């Protein structure tokens, strides 16, 4: 007995190794990423996070790409230099092993991931994906 | 206050529009798909569902691709003329609406989706991902 869990936690693509895809997070109220590697990496891989706004012309297409700021969590220290969120897939992460992170404070209605500059060489071997949690229609 | 919904319902890419991927479903007990189109389709597209088995050379790599049989419940009247489960995205699915579904009985350790013959040039405009549920180990 397995449940049709596509409704009630659907999942969409966010980076297939060649292109980012904005995923709409308005209809839901919780979401997270589930990274996954396809072949051994060369060094640490860093990804930027972006959030979009409803476009000025059409209200159901994403607007431009704005970068989401990052908040501390009562014990932070690293404190990324230009107060802007980023995720770093650590080196020596094998395949058949997934990692799952999530930005705390949501903003906008479309979120997106993009390979940070200087790290788009071995970023074609990662494939980020998103999964939301609970419809609020 | 959104949670790291990644762990506890992770998700992976099963069909990125150009090539398939086998996703391991041993560690979990329940799973389902979340179809999503990127551009308007031209006709009803049909995908085949495949399950793998642990390869004899290495039990952490999928073997060959077998096709999952079809299970009718009571209401089934189509029976797909083949006894081999398959999904079919109907025409008129606008590319801002997802569709969920899953097989009623898993078998093996892996699962895969690939476009059935005839609808191989429309499937380049769709995206299929798999999200699991609670981890057994």
């Amino acid at each position: 007995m397995n449940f049709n869990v596509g409704v009630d936690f659907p999942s969409f693509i966010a980076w297939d190794g060649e292109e980012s895809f904005p995923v709409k997070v308005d209809g839901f109220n919780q979401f997270g990423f589930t990274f996954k590697t396809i072949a051994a990496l060369t060094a640490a891989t860093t990804f930027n996070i972006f959030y979009h706004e409803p476009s000025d012309a059409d209200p159901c297409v994403p607007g431009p790409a704005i970068r989401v700021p990052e908040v501390p969590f009562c014990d932070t220290v690293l404190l990324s230099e230009d107060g802007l969120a980023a995720v770093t897939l650590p080196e020596t992460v094998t395949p058949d092993s997934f990692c799952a992170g999530t930005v705390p404070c949501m903003n906008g209605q479309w979120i997106s991931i993009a390979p940070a500059t200087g790290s788009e060489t071995n970023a074609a071997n990662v494939q980020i994906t998103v999964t939301m949690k609970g419809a609020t229609r | 206050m959104n949670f790291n919904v990644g762990v506890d319902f992770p998700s992976f890419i099963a069909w990125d529009g150009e090539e398939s991927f086998p996703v391991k479903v041993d560690g979990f007990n329940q799973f389902g798909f979340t179809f999503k189109t990127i551009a308007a389709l031209t006709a009803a597209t049909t995908f085949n569902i495949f399950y793998h088995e642990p390869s004899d050379a290495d039990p952490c790599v999928p073997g060959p691709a077998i096709r999952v049989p079809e299970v009718p419940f009571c209401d089934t009247v189509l029976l797909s003329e083949d006894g081999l489960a398959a999904v079919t995205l109907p025409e008129t699915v606008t590319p801002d609406s997802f569709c969920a579904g899953t097989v009623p009985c898993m078998n093996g350790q892996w699962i895969s989706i690939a476009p059935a013959t005839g609808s191989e040039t429309n499937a380049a405009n769709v995206q299929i991902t798999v999200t699991m549920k609670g981890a057994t180990r």
């Binding site: 650590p90 997934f98 705390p104 | 560690g27």
Partner: peptide, 28 residues
């Protein structure tokens, strides 16, 4: 500030020999 939590998917076996004390042998 995102924090990841990875975990493996497939385990590996664990084989190890069980060598025992050897045949008693006199030191002479």
């Amino acid at each position: 500030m995102v924090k990841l939590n990875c975990r493996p998917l497939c385990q590996a076996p664990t084989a190890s020999r069980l060598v025992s004390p050897p045949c008693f042998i006199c030191r002479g």
